[PDB]
Amino acid sequence: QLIAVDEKLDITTLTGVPEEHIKTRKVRIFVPARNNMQSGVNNTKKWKMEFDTRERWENPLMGWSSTADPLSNLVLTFSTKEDAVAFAEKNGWSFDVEERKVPKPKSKSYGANFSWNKRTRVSTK
Amino acid sequence: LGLREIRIHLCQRSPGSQGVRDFIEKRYVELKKANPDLPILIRECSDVQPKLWARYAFGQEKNVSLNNFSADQVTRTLENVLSGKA
Amino acid sequence: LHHALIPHGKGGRSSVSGIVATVFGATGFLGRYVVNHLGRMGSQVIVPYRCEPYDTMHLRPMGDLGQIIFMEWNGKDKDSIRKVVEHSNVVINLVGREWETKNFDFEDVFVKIPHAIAQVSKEAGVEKLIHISHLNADIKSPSRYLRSKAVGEKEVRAAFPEATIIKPSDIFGREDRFLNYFASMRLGKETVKQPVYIVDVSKGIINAIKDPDAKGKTFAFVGPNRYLLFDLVQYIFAVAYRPFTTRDKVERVHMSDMTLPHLPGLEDLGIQATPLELKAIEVLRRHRTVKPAKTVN
Amino acid sequence: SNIVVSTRTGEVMRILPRMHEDINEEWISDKTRFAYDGLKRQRLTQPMIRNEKGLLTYTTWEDALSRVAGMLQSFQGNDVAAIAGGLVDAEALVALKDLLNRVDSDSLCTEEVFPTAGAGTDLRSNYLLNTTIAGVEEADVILLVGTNPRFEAPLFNARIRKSWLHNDLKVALIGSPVDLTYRYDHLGDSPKILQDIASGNHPFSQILKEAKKPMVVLGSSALQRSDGTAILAAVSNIAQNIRLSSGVTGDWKVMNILHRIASQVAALDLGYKPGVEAIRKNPPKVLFLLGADGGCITRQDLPKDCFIIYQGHHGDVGAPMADVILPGAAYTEKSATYVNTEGRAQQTKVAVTPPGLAREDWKIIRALSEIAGMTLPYDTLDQVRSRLEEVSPNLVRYDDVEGANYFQQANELSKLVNQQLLADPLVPPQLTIKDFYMTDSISRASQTMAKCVKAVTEGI
Amino acid sequence: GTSVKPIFSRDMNEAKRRVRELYRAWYREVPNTVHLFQLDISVKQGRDKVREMFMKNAHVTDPRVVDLLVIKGKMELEETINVWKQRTHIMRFFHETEAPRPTDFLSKFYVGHDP
Amino acid sequence: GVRTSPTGEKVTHTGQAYDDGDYRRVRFSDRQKEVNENFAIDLIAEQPVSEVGSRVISCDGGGGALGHPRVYINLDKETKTGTCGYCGLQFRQPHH
Amino acid sequence: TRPTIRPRNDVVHKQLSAFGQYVAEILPKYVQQVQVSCFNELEIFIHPDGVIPVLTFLRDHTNAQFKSLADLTAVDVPTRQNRFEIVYNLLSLRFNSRIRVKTYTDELTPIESSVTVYKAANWYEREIWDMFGVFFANHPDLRRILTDYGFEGHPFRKDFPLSGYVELRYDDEVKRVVAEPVELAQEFRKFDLNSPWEAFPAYRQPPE
Ligand SMILES: NC(=O)C1=CN([C@@H]2O[C@H](COP(=O)(O)OP(=O)(O)OC[C@H]3O[C@@H](n4cnc5c(N)ncnc54)[C@H](OP(=O)(O)O)[C@@H]3O)[C@@H](O)[C@H]2O)C=CC1
Ligand SMILES: [Zn+2]
């Protein structure tokens, strides 16, 4: 009732993806960086998978942005790094993993602004 | 036949590179005085066996493993490479 | 290379190939295939037509939006030819007619119009010109058709020294006159034919456009196999399951195809000519309601 | 510094900083932020050759590659040379090195000068910021020699200012009294002050002696002058005296060098010869200009009818004197490896594709190698990076900064030659803000940088 | 461990048995498909296409993937036999209108940035 | 303020016109090129500057709810005039 | 609350909680979790092996008799080891109540067909197979129902591109409609709309 087969998962032959969109692609597994224009951090909570950028050219009519790859807008969301790595592996995609960047904790002291002898004393407020 | 450069790749903390570390620290300076014009590139590996590369004329390259070699062993390897004898 | 003419994309419908081609005689048999091949790779095609637009309607889906432009013209006015070939870097001459009319005989169609087109293209700065003549064209031919073809070839070479001359031999295809003319009869043993496939000729024209060193060369587009006319007609009738054009066309079909060993052919353009046996059923299935003919080589 | 490139419909829109605590925290320099305007002007989009009139004309990739390959096959050995610019990635560098090695040419040079005496580039710590950018926050005394950190490395100077403000860091400088946005001690200007400190007469030697985490920084601008070997030897003597007197605090790595261009460290790791002295000593008949726009070598320094190939992305001082122009890709148009002044390897990503017929640099070199019959083993980017790992394995560790310290060996090897110091004041190339905006081909083609230069030159 | 629920095949032998049955059925069907759809290809080239489509998946070592592929191929055969497809669906296996993409490095370098 | 390119084509208010060597001009052969004859920049340049004796005033484009969002413009600077960021109307204090 | 806020119904909430406890007690072999949402919707999470027993019990039991299968579909969550969750929506006319049953599966594990319990499931399972690639065992005739003949891939998977891989046009040379790789004249514009400054504190996750 159970096969108990030892082999890594591979579903490339079942997904219907063309041959040249499997071996030549390079997905990036990363936590997106915070938009430095804003202080919110709610967009740096999950892991993202994105594909490598391909050619975009100008349409001779309308000058619009034309593309020839179907994976230019495909972005996946994952809870953990391991989930993204497993999904990339079982789909036969070569991947690059970037470790999550966390802002290190810092020491803040409002009283350090009005310092008696240190350089941290502010000239205005 | 003319040797062009030598590259030594040793890992910083692995025990397989202990002999190469000792060789460098003790006598790389003397080897460099002996060959002031020969570039000996020392680089660091990671979770890889120590290796030595020799580049010859017209881009010919050969590599030898220095794993678990003592300082004397990698030394003798370098005189073998420099003199051209096998 | 005029950045707007720098190729982009992956050679598809919405790509850019850097080719701006003016195809004279694009409303005919070879013209539809030429325009289809030009438009499937994303090139700008100017289609000049003297005929009613309804008869050019079938060329519209052969290219992406804005890539096929239609303009009226006539062969007796140089201004129309000029305004059609101003912005093109490739000019293709496919104008021809197998019979004479009260307004155009063989001379205007095969000498005057090609010469005017070549002169106007030279004056307009067109980079490449491809002119189509016949394989059996020569000055001393009994038929005025081939004499006019030879004179027009000479005048095109004189006006446009870097023109590419292509000389096919009895093109066969779905809308091709040659397969159809023989099967619509519902002589021989002394005349020899070497027909060529339509797709082969269209791809040869496209590759000559692509080829950089095929500027002032002359090509002869012929098929793989060479047939006696009696056996060829017998094979045609066998494929069609059937029991076995005033004066010029009968003379042309009664004379044997020439051999031009020194003239480069389709093999030099990286094309393997397709045998008639593979496409004969495709062409002649509609004439209905296996023993290929013997060849001489 | 880590950045974010904003693109829309295949066009670069703006540059945003990307947070990295160890390198740039949250900030980028003004040049980094606003020089992307130069990526849309003076661009090389098609291959070019010389016609019968001696002018540059457009040609196909095949013709230009064949013309270069014929000259490459005609000459071999010392007659073939290459110069690498300030914006070249490790992939193109290793590709060019392999291609010229197949020709038996070792004259692979960079425009930036580093003293080759003693260890040279053999020991990696001899030309690195061994303390790292984050390590500045732990130092108590820092000495800057012959450099202007404010303009040469704005984020390094920002880190120094932060340490000065928060850790009460003591700063001293030898050179021109430039404004660094913090107070420092101007020990003087003459290079003999280095010898005085190393001997022990200067009080700053004792100040360094009392320091628990001393740090000495020498800029490559000070190495660009003819006294580079002597200046490096003096700074190494100071560091060795510090180590001998204060003892071994641990893995502190007092010795440091601050680099100014993004391609120098990777080229030195790959075995490129720093400086252009080899070209002057042995003029070539075929010269490769891989993005070299420094003007170090002109046609006056080359023999008659020398063949010059320029590969790059901008039309600048290096382009008009070339015989064949190969349009390359900028840093925003390729996935390329760069190694910073710390020795940390980082990779860019493709934001937009190169314009026109421009191609990836290593792809151009590999295609040229195939045309000449000297086909290179690699075919994809992964194989190029495998070759990089074969040559220098640290080039594939994409966030590692740790490395072995070989200060003793380099210091001992630096005592062989005894070149004398000249009596010329240390003057950094960037003296005021006006010299900071225009440094490279991308910056020189930027209208925003021109506006900044105009504003600082005359103000309203 | 790595115990999984079977679909049809417990091991590889019976999975290959189903593969061979599907191949037999397709091989038998090729001439009827060629005649009934009035295709311009020959029976030999249709069987060559069937063989090529079967060989594209020769690397699979998972019996579950193998029997899912067999299920998909049997659906394909059911579509072909019942004439639910038209001639375009059958001819889509041959890519006659697609210009060939060269494989060598130089051609890809010349055409564009696509590796 | 429609200008004419040296080729002969009208230059639109965005300033674009096909170059002499541009093949894309062929689309206008036997046809015409749509150019809007009313240039907004000139039309707003013809509007006289309003004189108001107030330090801060508001502009909503006229028509009340049929205009643009109401914004307040400071008129302390005498070197230049205050301009609405939505409508382009200019305002100025009565100097002297 | 105020007239802009949807009112709550505690009686229906209690009734649904009691019936969820009842069903969970009767079938402890398959039921893994029972939930009642704030808008009074009851969900029962079961093991995949219990699809037929649980559905048969819910259809045939005197106190349940959910005689109507409202909808059957799948949801794709790539981050889970079991990629797909199967959702059954049932309606009871006798007690005027609705219930939801969820299970899970991956690309290679078949799910037992429920056509013997509900005849309506025949086309729903075909649609699930067509759009997600989930195989249903012992189905009367499982085949594509929505996509074109010969279509490769399962479009409703998250990693399937929006515009697909191939596009159709008429070719005059071959006198038929052909398929070619997709090439957009204008690429679809991807919009980054998700804002920082998290909106709903009640759903905040532990920072792990
Ligand atoms: N067996 C063959 O078909 C081979 C053809 N030849 C040559 O190859 C070329 C293409 O042949 P093919 O396509 O089969 O011939 P078609 O009759 O099918 O097409 C002839 C084209 O030329 C145009 N044309 C003809 N006469 C005039 C005219 N007086 N003014 C303007 N346009 C005109 C037609 O337009 P419209 O529809 O308005 O009449 C039409 O577009 C021709 O030059 C032909 O002579 C080469 C060897 C044999
Ligand atoms: Zn207003």
Side-chain angles (χ1 to χ4, degrees), chain F residues 1-94:
Chain F
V2 185
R3 212 179 84 265
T4 290
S5 178
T7 311
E9 283 186 353
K10 296 183 290 294
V11 178
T12 80
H13 79 283
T14 53
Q16 63 84 30
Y18 284 138
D19 291 330
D20 299 333
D22 211 317
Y23 73 99
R24 274 170 303 158
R25 269 146 65 231
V26 73
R27 76 183 58 182
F28 297 135
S29 305
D30 268 339
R31 307 193 280 207
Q32 62 87 234
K33 165 172 174 170
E34 294 293 328
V35 184
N36 194 256
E37 294 293 328
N38 303 313
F39 278 28
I41 177 161
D42 291 331
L43 290 175
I44 194 61
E46 313 177 2
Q47 290 298 295
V49 179
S50 192
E51 288 272 322
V52 298
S54 181
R55 184 176 178 179
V56 169
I57 62 171
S58 72
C59 182
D60 63 355
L66 294 177
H68 65 72
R70 194 216 289 132
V71 290
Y72 295 80
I73 315 181
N74 174 271
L75 312 170
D76 274 347
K77 190 179 290 184
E78 293 166 353
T79 64
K80 70 176 185 64
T81 79
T83 299
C84 181
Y86 286 92
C87 182
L89 288 178
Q90 291 173 264
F91 311 90
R92 174 216 308 142
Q93 280 196 79

Side-chain angles (χ1 to χ4, degrees), chain D residues 143-253:
Chain D
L143 168 69
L144 307 159
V145 183
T147 186
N148 191 355
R150 183 182 194 197
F151 304 133
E152 301 172 358
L155 277 296
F156 181 67
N157 198 59
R159 185 80 59 152
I160 293 181
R161 159 72 187 216
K162 167 182 172 187
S163 299
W164 173 95
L165 190 71
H166 285 125
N167 302 103
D168 220 326
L169 168 70
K170 175 181 279 163
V171 191
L173 171 81
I174 293 162
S176 292
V178 296
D179 185 294
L180 292 177
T181 72
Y182 47 82
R183 183 180 63 83
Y184 60 87
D185 315 305
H186 195 214
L187 305 184
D189 208 345
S190 295
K192 318 200 92 63
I193 300 159
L194 292 165
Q195 283 173 347
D196 294 359
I197 293 170
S199 73
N201 296 115
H202 212 271
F204 196 71
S205 62
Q206 192 269 331
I207 292 170
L208 284 163
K209 212 182 307 163
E210 293 179 353
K212 298 293 183 182
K213 302 276 200 62
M215 183 177 177
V216 185
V217 179
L218 172 65
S220 307
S221 47
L223 300 174
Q224 292 321 289
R225 52 187 280 167
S226 68
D227 298 4
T229 296
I231 292 169
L232 188 64
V235 177
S236 197
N237 195 4
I238 293 179
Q240 188 274 331
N241 282 348
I242 279 171
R243 190 180 71 180
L244 183 62
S245 85
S246 175
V248 186
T249 309
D251 55 356
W252 176 233
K253 311 174 92 158

Side-chain angles (χ1 to χ4, degrees), chain C residues 65-191:
Chain C
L65 298 190
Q67 292 281 66
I68 307 188
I69 299 184
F70 300 90
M71 281 180 239
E72 293 179 353
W73 71 280
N74 80 317
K76 296 181 185 291
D77 203 27
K78 292 181 181 180
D79 293 334
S80 77
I81 311 189
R82 192 225 55 231
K83 82 173 179 67
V84 175
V85 307
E86 307 212 344
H87 307 97
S88 303
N89 52 15
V90 181
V91 165
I92 317 184
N93 189 8
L94 262 50
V95 170
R97 188 63 70 203
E98 277 167 302
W99 55 90
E100 286 182 337
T101 74
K102 64 182 181 293
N103 288 120
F104 305 94
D105 47 318
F106 289 137
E107 172 145 347
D108 313 290
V109 167
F110 288 126
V111 176
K112 288 168 155 313
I113 286 173
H115 176 61
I117 286 172
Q119 198 150 75
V120 167
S121 307
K122 178 55 64 185
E123 277 166 343
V126 178
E127 293 179 353
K128 309 180 175 186
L129 189 150
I130 290 178
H131 169 80
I132 310 292
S133 51
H134 210 282
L135 172 81
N136 309 324
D138 75 38
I139 287 285
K140 274 158 208 83
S141 176
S143 55
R144 284 153 73 231
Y145 180 97
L146 301 160
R147 293 208 284 279
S148 296
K149 282 278 209 194
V151 173
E153 179 171 346
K154 182 174 72 68
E155 287 191 356
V156 161
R157 194 60 86 179
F160 209 103
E162 316 87 24
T164 297
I165 305 293
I166 286 177
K167 302 157 75 77
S169 86
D170 277 298
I171 309 167
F172 73 88
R174 292 179 183 270
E175 32 279 321
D176 79 315
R177 277 172 186 77
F178 174 88
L179 268 193
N180 300 329
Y181 169 85
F182 281 136
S184 296
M185 292 187 189
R186 82 290 184 274
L187 277 300
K189 289 291 184 65
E190 293 297 332
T191 187

Side-chain angles (χ1 to χ4, degrees), chain A residues 5-110:
Chain A
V5 61
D6 201 79
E7 192 54 41
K8 67 184 184 157
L9 200 61
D10 211 33
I11 61 171
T12 61
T13 49
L14 301 168
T15 58
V17 182
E19 190 276 331
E20 61 87 20
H21 289 304
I22 300 175
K23 294 181 176 67
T24 45
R25 313 305 312 245
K26 174 69 75 176
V27 289
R28 182 172 174 248
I29 296 172
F30 69 108
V31 174
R34 177 185 63 84
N35 188 5
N36 189 359
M37 311 285 297
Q38 285 178 277
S39 310
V41 300
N42 205 55
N43 276 336
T44 71
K45 305 285 187 181
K46 315 310 290 188
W47 289 83
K48 291 293 183 69
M49 186 188 301
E50 65 183 1
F51 283 80
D52 50 305
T53 299
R54 291 296 175 95
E55 199 209 345
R56 287 178 181 103
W57 66 95
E58 178 197 317
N59 196 50
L61 189 76
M62 294 298 102
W64 289 334
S65 179
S66 306
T67 189
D69 62 357
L71 304 169
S72 58
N73 292 314
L74 183 63
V75 168
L76 301 159
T77 311
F78 294 92
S79 281
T80 60
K81 182 180 73 175
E82 300 60 65
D83 294 325
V85 167
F87 195 83
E89 265 158 32
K90 94 176 160 192
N91 274 284
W93 283 319
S94 182
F95 59 92
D96 279 7
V97 172
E98 304 193 346
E99 304 314 311
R100 179 199 280 275
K101 297 270 203 44
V102 176
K104 64 189 209 272
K106 323 200 162 73
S107 284
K108 313 301 297 186
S109 170
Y110 183 71

